[PDB]
């Protein structure tokens, strides 16, 4: 329709932003950036709806233009910067670091972390490709290209990214029995261990995941993110650890507060 759209009408925004319906006609359209339009979370949304620090978008940009907010080590003064999964949002005024991770309901949970582990971040290797001059490189889930990767880093593996030098410190290899986050689909926000991978040449790769409670759910390889081995996640998990209690036991946990 003659070009790229610059508006995002409310009720067209991604639902996991928990945006109010009758606030205005429009939502913050995620600018082009590292992750995606749908799988992103704008800094305005995370500053005005997930922490209530700012009250308006004006106040969000006021917070942003004095270099308070910081996404993955850099300033990111963009009001609608598309921060996403495994991103580190550190603010030095009110010094605290968050890691954008998915709760078990499928929203971007507010997950405070410490500087000693916010130093780095994780990245799912989107592709391994030889660049110009025969220099190998890896592309990660957040759109990062890292040259001279370990010759044993393949697709669907995860790499620990320094986030200050932007290099690969370690890498977890996709295989049966490693801890995986689910970053899309019905089970978006669950954590489990890889049990089996169905190949489906041509079609879509499927993976069967068994959470701590021995629940076994299958999902597409596109949205599973290796985060370490069982019991040793290379990152800190949010308050729920992706267990996916049913509504009955959720109501039970709720009524356990009398």
């Amino acid at each position: 329709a003659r070009g790229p759209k610059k508006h995002l009408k409310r009720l067209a925004a991604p639902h996991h932003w928990l945006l109010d319906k009758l606030s205005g006609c429009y939502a913050p359209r995620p600018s082009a950036g590292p992750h995606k339009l749908r799988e992103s979370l704008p800094l305005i949304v995370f500053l005005r709806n997930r922490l209530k620090y700012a009250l308006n978008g004006r106040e969000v940009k006021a917070i942003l233009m004095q270099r308070h907010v910081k996404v993955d080590g850099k300033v990111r003064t963009d009001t609608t910067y598309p921060a996403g999964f495994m991103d580190v949002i550190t603010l030095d005024a009110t010094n605290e670091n968050f890691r954008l991770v998915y709760d078990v309901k499928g929203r971007f949970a507010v997950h405070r972390i410490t500087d000693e582990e916010a130093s780095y971040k994780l990245g799912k290797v989107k592709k391994v490709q030889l660049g110009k001059k025969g220099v190998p490189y890896v592309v990660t889930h957040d759109g990062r290209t890292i040259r001279y990767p370990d010759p044993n880093i393949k697709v669907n593996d995860t790499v620990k990214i320094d986030l200050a030098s932007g290099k690969i410190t370690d890498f977890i290899k996709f295989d049966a029995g490693k801890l995986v986050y689910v970053t899309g689909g019905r089970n978006l926000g669950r954590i489990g261990t890889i049990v089996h991978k169905e190949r489906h040449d041509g079609g879509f790769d499927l993976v069967h995941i068994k959470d701590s409670l021995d629940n076994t759910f299958v999902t597409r390889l596109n949205n599973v993110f290796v985060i370490g081995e069982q019991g040793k996640p290379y990152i800190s998990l949010p308050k729920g650890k992706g267990i996916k209690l049913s509504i009955a036991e959720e109501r039970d946990r709720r009524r356990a507060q009398q």
Binding site: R10, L22, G24, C25, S246, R251
Partner: protein, 185 residues
């Protein structure tokens, strides 16, 4: 434009307009409970039809089916909280076997009367309409209120509303200002 504003009807007229037995039953209910019009009975029967539909959908499901368990428990909880479903009838079949008077009993216009705060249901209606009744720390001027079975211990007069506190009223002041003259001085 802004997202649409959801709205629903709350009542349903009867299919037969001039059924004399239904008319007499509606007038009996309206006289007993001090109702302004047949639309209040219509609204209560609409709520009851929705409740009955949900209960029927659940009862057709298998027992210990998670959806039936969860939603029937929620419906029964809501009904016993409102006081329509009694304490010993938490089975989802008594939900089906409920009635219009079970909802008309929990009306604040009925509770105010049954608590002696009013001389009749019409006294209760005017007393709620005139901001005289407070449920908690909150004046409630709506006859249809569906007391939560905990507000029952708290339905009393307001600090306003010169039957339960500070002020003496409005016509009392003018009658005092004219009784000053009526005294002669």
């Amino acid at each position: 434009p802004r997202a649409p504003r959801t709205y629903s009807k709350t009542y349903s007229t009867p299919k037969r307009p001039y059924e004399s037995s239904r008319l007499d039953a509606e007038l009996k209910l309206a006289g007993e409970f001090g109702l302004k019009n047949k639309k209040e009975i219509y609204r209560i029967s609409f709520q009851l039809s929705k409740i009955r539909r949900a209960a029927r959908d659940l009862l057709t499901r298998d027992e210990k089916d998670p959806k039936r368990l969860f939603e029937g428990n929620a419906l029964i909880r809501r009904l016993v909280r409102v006081g329509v479903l009694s304490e010993d009838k938490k089975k989802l079949d008594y939900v089906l076997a409920l009635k219009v008077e079970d909802f008309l009993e929990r009306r604040l216009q009925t509770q105010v009367y049954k608590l002696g705060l009013a001389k009749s249901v019409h006294h209760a209606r005017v007393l709620i309409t005139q901001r005289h009744i407070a449920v908690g720390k909150q004046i409630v001027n709506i006859p249809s209120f569906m007391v939560r079975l905990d507000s029952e211990k708290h339905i009393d007069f307001a600090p306003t509303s010169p039957f339960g506190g500070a002020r003496p009223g409005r016509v009392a002041r003018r009658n005092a200002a004219r009784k000053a003259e009526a005294s002669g001085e």
